[PDB]
Amino acid sequence: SGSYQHLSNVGSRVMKRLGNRPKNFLPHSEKFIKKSTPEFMKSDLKEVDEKTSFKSEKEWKFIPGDRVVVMSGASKGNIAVIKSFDKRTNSFILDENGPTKTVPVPKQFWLEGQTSHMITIPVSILGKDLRLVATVAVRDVSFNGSYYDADYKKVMPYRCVKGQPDLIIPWPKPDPIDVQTNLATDPVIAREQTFWVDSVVRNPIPKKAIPSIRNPHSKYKRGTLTAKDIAKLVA
Amino acid sequence: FSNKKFIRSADDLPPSSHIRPWSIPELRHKSFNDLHSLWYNCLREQNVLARENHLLKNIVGSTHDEFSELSNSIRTTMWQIRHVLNERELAYSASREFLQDESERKKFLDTLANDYFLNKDEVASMLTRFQLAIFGISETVDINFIDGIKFLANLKLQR
């Protein structure tokens, strides 16, 4: 690139205008993007905005790891374990059994054990197009209760089949994250308590540190009135 | 640098699933010195990533952004730390204000006296902690210190 743009926020208004393009000229914007992208990169599904993005595990009806039947497609009536979701598109990438496309690929992105440039790759698919399985497929799932998961380490909801709430579709237990990194502090030290609220006389963090912690010349923090000030103000 | 590498590969980097930024609650029960150390470690990490990120963007013209994401995450933890530092000071100030109101302070002292002091079924240890907590008396001189001494004398007389 030879840019330097990344070390600053210059031409901010222009960037905002470009970034927040009007939605009725979104086809115009993306037409040229589509053209630019090669076949193996580009996706058919609409790149949804971060507002309309499934952040919660309730908003996603399915998690990476669970088993799902595909429908409304070429590879329909096919069971597939969903591998990973795409965040920008609001869609899932399924395993080998799911929907795919055969596309030419350059030798930069060649897998070990390839004869041809042609490679089959999995297309993204929406949560609307595929239904759960348990063999019995599920029409729709609803969430009514919640609980702390041991493996996920989150207060996740209970996936219950729509109609009869007692038939729980359980979450897929994820793979064990064997953490061995120098930049992650271990559980014992991460949580060990070294502070206690003890003193009322001595303040906990020093007076010379305050200017870093908060702006002492803050235009927002208005001063309170006094009697003398009132008297001065009023005729 | 990190392990004397011109650039951390994808394998050399810490993976996203294994890594989490600090929680504000977790930070809240850490000492000042510890927090300061953490902050400086974060800053160091950012510098390492910033060097690398710059190289990636300026020279090779990449859009891989793992380094950038890491830097952002670190920045998040830093501001959370900054917030908890401010919050602690504010809490202290509020406590001071509360104590300054005389009746409330008196009530608090009475409450302290009733439950744990002057009771049976340790006391010295409580007093030493209480001394530090409420007055300027460790094991230098002020009106507050004098008041604490007087209170201690009163407690002794009672007991």
């Binding site: 990169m41 795409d86 598109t89 869609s91 | -």
Partner: peptide, 15 residues
Amino acid sequence: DFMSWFKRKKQEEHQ
């Protein structure tokens, strides 16, 4: 999406 898939494939190959 493709890039992420490719990365996953590489990881699988490695392990």
